Ligand binder design. Structure first.
Ligand code: MG
Ligand code: MG
Ligand code: MG
Ligand code: MG
Ligand code: MG
Ligand code: MG
Ligand code: MG
Length: 224
RNA sequence: GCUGUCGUCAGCUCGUGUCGUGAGAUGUUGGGUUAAGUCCCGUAACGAGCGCAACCCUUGUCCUUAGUUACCAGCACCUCG
């Protein structure tokens, strides 16, 4: 907010100068010490416009999926999905999570039934030779599928933190014609992102800044 | 219909999705591990099916039920079986 909060945490940084997508050239303020620098004066209006978009979309009882699976990122994405609701993914994105959603509905149902019978009084009362490995199966399933337990329909908008890390996901969205909100860095390509946010990745302070901005926007939009 | 053979070898496929103009590919590739496509970890693939394993018969130890035509530890007789 107000050109200073992001000025300190991590935003004005880029993946060196050897690696850089030329299509991002319009968002480069300059290069210092063989590191690309992003022009904040251009990304503030885009960030505010995206916040307005998300706030207005959250008024209308509709879902925005959060995608942030990466080092030290999927965690805070999880706790930001905590409160304000909304779906999320924090571990590996399974190919076909959108274009092949009918098949993954079955795994959703299997997880829901297994978790129902797991905490129904601990129905896993049989011998531990099978109980521990069934619990391991539950753990592995909830690890990569826990976020979209709810949200039975297709999400309306997708929010991704890193863009080239999540390219598969973006492609699926671009096939179903749903908007994409992304934090595009220097190396990534802004192609396939409807609301490009030229920010920074890998910076915990920066990424939590985006997550809290999004959380407050969606909370205000849903409040009415 | 029934049978041999590869071969009791660990393999052979399908649905949806994705890649290629197409035949096709992916799943089923990779690091380990196993008798085993057995299992774990990663992974544009997510699942399922037939195989593998388990369920079956027998043998190896123990308990309850029962002691005839089977048995004889203890008692009595014994022509000494
Ligand atoms: Mg095959
Ligand atoms: Mg097939
Ligand atoms: Mg197929
Ligand atoms: Mg095609
Ligand atoms: Mg093949
Ligand atoms: Mg292998
Ligand atoms: Mg098997």
């Amino acid at each position: 907010v107000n050109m200073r909060d992001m000025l300190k945490a991590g935003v004005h940084f880029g993946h060196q100068t050897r690696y850089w997508n030329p299509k991002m050239g319009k968002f480069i303020f300059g290069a210092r010490n063989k590191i690309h620098i992003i022009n904040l004066e251009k990304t503030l209006p885009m960030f505010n416009e995206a916040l307005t978009f998300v706030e207005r979309l959250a008024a209308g009882k509709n879902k925005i999926l959060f995608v942030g699976t990466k080092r030290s990122a999927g965690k805070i994405v999880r706790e930001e999905a905590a409160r304000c609701g909304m779906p999320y993914v924090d571990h590996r994105w399974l190919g076909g999570m959108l274009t092949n959603y009918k098949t993954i509905r079955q795994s959703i149902k299997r997880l829901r039934d297994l978790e129902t019978q797991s905490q129904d009084g601990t129905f896993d009362k049989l011998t531990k030779k099978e109980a521990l490995m069934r619990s391991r199966d539950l753990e592995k399933l909830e690890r990569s599928l826990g976020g979209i337990k709810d949200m039975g329909g297709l999400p309306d908008a997708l929010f991704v933190i890193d863009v080239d890390h999540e390219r598969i996901a973006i492609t699926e969205a671009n096939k179903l014609g749903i908007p994409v909100i992304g934090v595009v860095d220097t190396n990534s390509s802004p192609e396939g992102v409807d609301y490009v946010i030229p920010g920074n990745d890998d910076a915990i302070r920066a990424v939590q800044l985006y997550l809290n901005s999004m959380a407050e926007a969606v909370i205000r939009g849903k409040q009415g």
